[PDB]
Design a protein around this ligand. Structure first.
Ligand code: NA
Ligand code: NA
Lengths: 147, 146, 146, 146
C-alpha cells in the first residue's frame, strides 16, 4: 500500500548506482592491478568478484586488500573510496525504508491532532451557542414581565 | 502540472535502466562471448540477447539455460540483471501511480480544510447574530426600567 | 532557498544525460564504426556525431539517414537516443518551472491561512466586546431591582 | 532524523560524481592519451590528471593548457567536466544546507500553529466564563420579578 510503494523509485536509484560502483571500480581495478594480480583483478569478472569479497568481509584473514596494499603502497586511494561509497549506498537502502515508515506515522499523527483541534472548537462553540439561546429566551421572558 | 512534476524521476529510472543494459552487456561479453559468440560475442549481440531475455522471447528457446548449463554459476549474473531491470520498469509505472494519487490526496486536502473554515465562519456568524438580537432586547429591558 | 532546493535534481538529470551520450557513443562505435569510420569510428567521433544529431546540424546533411539506409533496422538506436536525451533536457527546464511555481503556491498558502486566522481573531474580538457591554448593562438592570 | 532524511540524495550526487570521473577518464584516454601518454595514456593516469585539474594543482603547471594548445578545440571536454563535477560537489553542500534550514522551518511551523490554537482556546474560555457569570445575573434579575 502506498506509503512504502512511494519510496521504491529512490530505492532503485541507490541500488542502480550501487551496481554502477562495482562496474567502474572493477574496470578500474582491472587496469591498476590485474597486471600484477591476474588471479584477483586479471579479468573484469575476477575484479567484480574480488571487490564483492572485500565488501562481504571474506577477505578478512586471507585479505585480498593487504597484499595489493603492500605491493602498491598508494592503493588505498582505490580500496578506501570503494568501500566507503558502496557501504554508504547499502546504508541508504535501509535508511530509505526507515524514513518511509516513520514518515507515514508522522503524517497520520498530523491529522489525528488536527481533527482533535477542529473537534474541540466545534464543541466549544456549540456549548457557547446553546448557552446563548437559553439566555435569549430568559431575556424575552424578562421583557414580558415588563409589558 | 501534477504529472509534469514527476517526469525528472521517470527519466532517472529510465536513464539508469539503460545503464543496466550497458554494463551487463559489457559484462556479458567478457564472461560468455568466448564460448557463446552468437549471443554475447559482441557488445551489440550482448545488448540484444539481454533484451530478448527480458521480453521472454527466450522462454522455450531460452538463451539463459544453455549458458547456465555450461557455466553452472552464471545465475550470479542472469538473476541480478533480471531483478534490477524488472524493478526499474516497475518504478516507471509506480512513479505514475504515485503522481496521480498524490494529486487526488492534495485536492481532498483543501476541500476538507475549506469545509472546516466554512463551518466555523458560519457557526460564529450564527452566534453573533443571536448576540445582537439579545443585546437589543436587553436595552429594551433597561428602558422600561428608566 | 527555493531554487537552491532543486539543484541536486538538476544535476541528476544533467549527470544521467551525459551518461546517455557515453553509452550511446560506445554503442554507436560498435554498431556502425566499421562501416562509418568518419562518424562512429572512434569514441570521440561517436560522441560528436550524436551531439550533431541532437543539435539538428544533421538536418540536410543528415548523418542518421545514410546509416539508416545501410542498416535498415538502425532506428532502434537513433530513435531511443533522441528520445531519452531530449526528455532529459526537457526535465532540466521542467525542474526549474516546478521550483518557481512550487514557491508561489507555498507563499499563497500562508497569506490565505493568516487571513483566516486574522478574520477569526477579529470576529471573536468583536463578539467579546459586544459581550462585556451587555454584561455591564445587565448589572445596571439588577441595580434598578435592589 | 532530519539530516538522516537527506543522505540518500547525498549519495546519488556522490555516486553520479564518481561516474563523471570514470566516463571523462575513459573519454580523456581516447581523445588525448595518444599524444599525452604521461597524463591520459592509461585509464588510471586519466582519472588522476582529471583529479589534479579539479583540485587546482594544475594552475601554474596546468595540464589543461598544453593539451588546449595542441588540440585547439579540447575545451569542449575540459569545460563540461569542470562544470558538472563542480556542480555536483556544490550539490553536496547545498543538500546539507537545505536539510538544516528545512528542519527549522518545519519547527517554527508548529510553534506558530500551537500559539494560534492556544490563543483561540483561551479567547473562547474568556468569553465562555463571561457568559456564565452573565447567565447567573440574569436569573437573579428574574427572581426580582417573581
Ligand atoms: Na565502459
Ligand atoms: Na573502455
Amino acid at each position: 500500500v502506498e506509503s512504502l510503494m512511494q519510496a521504491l523509485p529512490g530505492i532503485g536509484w541507490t541500488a542502480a548506482l550501487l551496481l554502477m560502483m562495482f562496474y567502474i571500480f572493477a574496470v578500474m581495478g582491472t587496469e591498476l592491478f590485474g597486471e600484477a594480480f591476474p588471479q584477483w583483478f586479471g579479468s573484469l569478472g575476477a575484479s567484480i568478484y574480488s571487490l564483492f569479497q572485500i565488501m562481504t568481509l571474506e577477505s578478512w584473514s586471507m585479505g585480498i586488500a593487504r597484499p595489493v596494499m603492500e605491493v602498491y603502497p598508494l592503493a588505498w586511494i582505490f580500496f578506501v573510496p570503494f568501500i566507503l561509497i558502496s557501504s554508504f549506498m547499502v546504508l541508504n537502502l535501509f535508511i530509505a525504508i526507515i524514513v518511509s515508515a516513520t514518515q507515514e506515522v508522522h503524517e497520520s499523527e498530523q491529522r489525528a491532532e488536527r481533527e482533535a483541534n477542529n473537534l474541540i472548537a466545534h464543541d466549544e462553540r456549540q456549548e457557547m451557542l446553546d448557552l446563548m439561546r437559553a439566555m435569549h429566551a430568559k431575556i424575552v421572558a424578562l421583557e414580558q414581565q415588563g409589558k
